Amino acid sequence: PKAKTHSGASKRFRRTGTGKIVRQKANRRHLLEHKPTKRTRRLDGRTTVSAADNSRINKLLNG
Amino acid sequence: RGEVSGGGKKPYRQKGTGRARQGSTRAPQFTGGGTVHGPKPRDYSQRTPKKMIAAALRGALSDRARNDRIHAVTELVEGQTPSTKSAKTFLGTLTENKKVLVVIGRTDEVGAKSVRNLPGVHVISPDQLNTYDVLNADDVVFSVEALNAYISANSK
Amino acid sequence: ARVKRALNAQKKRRTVLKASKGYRGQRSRLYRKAKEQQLHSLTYAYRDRRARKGEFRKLWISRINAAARANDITYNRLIQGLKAAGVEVDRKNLAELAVSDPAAFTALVDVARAALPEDVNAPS
Amino acid sequence: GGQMPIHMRLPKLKGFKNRFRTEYQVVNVGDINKAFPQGGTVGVDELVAKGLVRKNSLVKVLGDGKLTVKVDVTANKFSGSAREAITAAGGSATEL
RNA sequence: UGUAAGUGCACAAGGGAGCUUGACUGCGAGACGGACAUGUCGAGCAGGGACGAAAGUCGGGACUAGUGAUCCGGCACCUCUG
RNA sequence: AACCAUAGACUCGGCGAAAUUGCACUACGAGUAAAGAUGCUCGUUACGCGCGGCAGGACGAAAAGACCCCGGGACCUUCACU
RNA sequence: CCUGCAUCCGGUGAAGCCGCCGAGUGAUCGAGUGGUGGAGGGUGUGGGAGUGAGAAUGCAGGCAUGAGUAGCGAUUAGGCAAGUGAGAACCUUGCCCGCCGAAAGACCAAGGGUUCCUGGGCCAGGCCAGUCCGCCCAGGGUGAGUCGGGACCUAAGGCGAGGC
RNA sequence: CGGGGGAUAAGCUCCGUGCGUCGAGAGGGAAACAGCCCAGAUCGCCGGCUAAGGCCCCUAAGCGUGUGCUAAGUGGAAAAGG
RNA sequence: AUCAAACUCCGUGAUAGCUGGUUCUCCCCGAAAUGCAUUUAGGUGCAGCGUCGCAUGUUUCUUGCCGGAGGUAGAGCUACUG
RNA sequence: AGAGCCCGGUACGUGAAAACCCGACGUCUGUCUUGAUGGUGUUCCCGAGUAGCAGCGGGCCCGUGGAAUCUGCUGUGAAUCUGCCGGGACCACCCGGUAAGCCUGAAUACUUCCCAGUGACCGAUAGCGGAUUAGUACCGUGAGGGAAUGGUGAAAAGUACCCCGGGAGGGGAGUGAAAGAGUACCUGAAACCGUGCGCUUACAAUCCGUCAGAGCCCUCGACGUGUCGUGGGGUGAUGGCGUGCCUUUUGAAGAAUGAGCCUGCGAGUCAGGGACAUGUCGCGAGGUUAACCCGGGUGGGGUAGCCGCAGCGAAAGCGAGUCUGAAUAGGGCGUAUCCACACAAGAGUGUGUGGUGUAGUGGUGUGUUCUGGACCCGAAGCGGAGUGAUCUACCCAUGGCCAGGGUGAA
RNA sequence: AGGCGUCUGGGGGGAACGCGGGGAAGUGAAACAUCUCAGUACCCGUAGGAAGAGAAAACAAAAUGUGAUUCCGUGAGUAGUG
């Protein structure tokens, strides 16, 4: 019975060339009126996930 | 437990009986019941690379040649007349060790049919040579045509 | 294959009973209850093997004190005199000699008394 | 522990798949130079024989390395650097 | 000293007066504490501005509270796809 | 409150029962501790083995407490939802 | 324990069991010795385990105490002479006494199937012993034109050709 | 040890302590007594030296030495006060 | 012989954040009962605390000296509020 | 008592009255040759309540969402070759096809039965519930549930005969190798109950042992009557020490639970080219085969597939670079790593040239993990299908039953 | 319509395998209505030794491609869906 890969994880994460895990930051979709300009600018872009939770994520994506 | 017969009911009440409190009549703890982890049908087939097997066979034959345990016979015994006595005499003259392997081409039957009965002899077609068979016997006797066919097929 | 626990357990149980032979009550007839008191016996033997040192030292000291008091000198002063004279013989030797050679014991006591200092109360 | 975890409380990736992709396979001019000392004509068949790219896939060459041997190149797509390198190496390259 | 307390402000951040919307865009070298994501500051570059002759300051409010993830959907624009 | 008879309880003859059961040549006064000790400290008493009687203790036997709470069922009621 | 391979032991006694004597730092070991037995085993090196018990108010089988203790299943109650036989208060004969008698008696239908008689014995059973038995063995035994049913008729109800 | 809740009560509860121990720790010491004092168990020895505490007998070691207090079994249960 | 929803075969080895049990040996090393969060408090994820290996290996710790900012203990009031 | 040459038979040969089925060889049945071949313009045909459309439901990944296709029901309802339907709404241009009628073997799925074979599967609490009276006895009026019971020996030669006795039972003498084989019959352990022998105890406060320890008794040596010895054994008068086992507990010898004893039975395994990690063997810029064929056989073929070989970007794409962006202007990702050489600040490092140059992939051991109940066992309750009103409730048709004595309406 | 006479066929059983319908609840989401369990158990009507399906109103996309149906391995746990 071939292994099952979690739908959400493979849909909300990505693998880079060398094997690091990347994600996107939250608190951006809506209601950013009071947020100053530098807020979204810093809150934009990608970032490498913290190494603390790396082990769990790797298991999910692989299955 | 789930496949043996019977044992479909709770044997008695739960509280107030006072004896051992049980759930089913054919539980693994009862005598005559099922087994926790019993052997189940399975298959022992194994994968082995062709390169590995060929290298093993080549090494075995190379060692046999190094130790000088290979001999070539044009033919076992005069054809169209099986005779075990002549074959036994010829094998004794050739070698005196207990066990020996003889390989003969498929299209010939008289040699095998005459050499079948010897206790320490095993017959094998040249196309089915295998490491276990070569190792088991101490010496190997090759027919000329069989040897030629094997060498040609392998070198091709 | 199917294997039957025939010999493995019976070997250990035979040796346990053989070692346990000589007890009282069920403890010498029932295997299950036996080994508990086997453990207790081994622990007690371990403990008293060490306690033997103190017990024998106690007996030797008692005997030496009795002999010295009979010979009219205290045990503490006798040991002090022996230490001053620098004779290293052991309490067991003194005890055996006293039970065997009262003359030798008296000679040793006299030597110790001679070797004793002038005043035991001096601040030195 | 009841709390919605990371895979539950983070946004999604940004975009779609575009199943109409048309990938090629990369070939390095430096590797070709290293593998073909004498030079000459090159093509998909001999490239596959040398085992540089998958046989059924589409072929495209890249010019990261340095070239010093005349060669005739036949492929499906080219990059500017590879084109200039081939031209300067005293050779010619054509596209189907 | 708008809104509680503390920390501060008598040189002002207290009050008065003239002009004007930087309560911009594109960026960010490095740090702050945090199990996780949330939170805070920042020199300096370019465009085009404001005030001021100049030097110079301005990416909201003397400071610390006035708020809310995910999914789904609406609206304007786009050199994406179809 | 007293007395008398019947069937047991008592000895003799025959057949022959159940619950429980960690162990035993299983005292007590004052203490000591998971706070109430036959089984630990100090001290006092006490020939070995039986039979007929009395039931304070051995937290005596009986049913994984009904009373309380936690978790899960069942039935019931309605202007709780569908 | 079962297995591939190479070896050795065995009706001149192989496997378990019960001792003696010893031995390793452990789970233990003895190609060292004694009794019982009669038919397969050990060492070396590989592969595979249903491969190791004391407790779950566990389960199958056997056996401990209470115990030679309680009871021996009512509201009537036995006694004597003789007989049988090895054994008799409990079996057979005879004579006294008591009890029941709208039943502790005489029968029908329903209900069981050989408990009925003759002949045999008393390792199983009868709450004790049994010559006895509703114990068993072997044989025998059930006679309707008129008694109860069917061949005579019907009810509450069931089946149901067609049909809905 | 320094604190809050409490009646400046609990063998109560809640904090902080490059704090000890028990929990996961035998021996000796205080009669017994996990959380106190000394002291960290590789094994054997019929050997020596010591910490804590003791030296009338139970019970090994001093009815030790020199200078002073006690009349209450104070020694071997506690305060205002007399 | 059981009824606030009878009995038998099956779905069926119904399912438990809950109670119980889990066996032959030796050598080395050796824990926590804390913080954050939680339809969460006797459950569970992460952090700290252990072991094996890999890589840089004294960067760890104690003492002496040197440069550093605090607002407790204390103390004080014609130095501010009482 | 372990047999190639003792017997049954195995290699090999033969072999059938009758019958079976297959295959091949023979009268008979029937279309066509009154008919076939290549061209042309005109008039008719190519499967009816169907296709399509509208509403309500199904199953295709599509869980009404824009909803393509097939299909169930209800209304409406079309055309015949420049006709019609299909290429995930739809229009236009292209491309394919001709539904509304019917048959069609071969590649595939399975064993109640019969024939022939195999077991690194079980050996009487295992093995199918069933090695014997077997779905029997037995329990339940019903559906139904569901038991335990092998080994004498070469043959019975199953102990003539005599004795004690009623028998049961036993002793001699014989059978036989054994009778320590006597139908209760192989090998015979522990709980359990014994008889004989040696030691010890009736003034004693013991989780019942250990360390010392006189006497008595048995034994091995040297020496003599009993006395020592690098001696062993059993008993123990008497002194010191000494709070059971497992669970769960911060905390228990407990008066927190489990254990009557004994022999058996009962527990981290398996399946998948799965995943991560870690050793082991070949190959090396390749590795690697499925399904399937030929071999009584594990062997030989089989390029269909999967991973590294270049990455960035949601994309049109580009490429040792790439996206953001007006910006060579900084940033995010990548060019194995390093050394050396030059340029910058020494804002920690970056920017340009040259080298050695990169290691992954198949089998397999082991720890964990994924999907199956996955360490073991454990309820109140739900649904489907079936069984009961012989007691108990009510009713229906049909009989029987009530001993004696008082009270006195119309 | 119905009624007579005469011929031809049918009423049940069978371990598994097929075709077309009907068709449940335990359980996971730490609950649960959507889902999943599952078109599973069971039932119904059905024949055979096999059955069903079957001769394009089929795919693909500018290749001058395949050419009835069925069954396996890949195509991939990907394009999607919740």
Ligand SMILES: [Mg+2]
């Ligand atoms: Mg996906």
Ligand SMILES: [Mg+2]
């Ligand atoms: Mg947006």
Ligand SMILES: [Mg+2]
């Ligand atoms: Mg904005």
Ligand SMILES: [Mg+2]
């Ligand atoms: Mg942006």
Ligand SMILES: [Mg+2]
């Ligand atoms: Mg971690």
Ligand SMILES: [Mg+2]
């Ligand atoms: Mg009981």
Ligand SMILES: [Mg+2]
């Ligand atoms: Mg069982």
Ligand SMILES: [Mg+2]
């Ligand atoms: Mg069974």
Ligand SMILES: [Mg+2]
């Ligand atoms: Mg079984």
Ligand SMILES: [Mg+2]
């Ligand atoms: Mg192969």
Ligand SMILES: [Mg+2]
């Ligand atoms: Mg004794």
Ligand SMILES: [Mg+2]
């Ligand atoms: Mg000492």
Ligand SMILES: [Mg+2]
């Ligand atoms: Mg101002």
Ligand SMILES: [Mg+2]
């Ligand atoms: Mg704003």
Ligand SMILES: [Mg+2]
């Ligand atoms: Mg930063």
Ligand SMILES: [Mg+2]
């Ligand atoms: Mg400017």
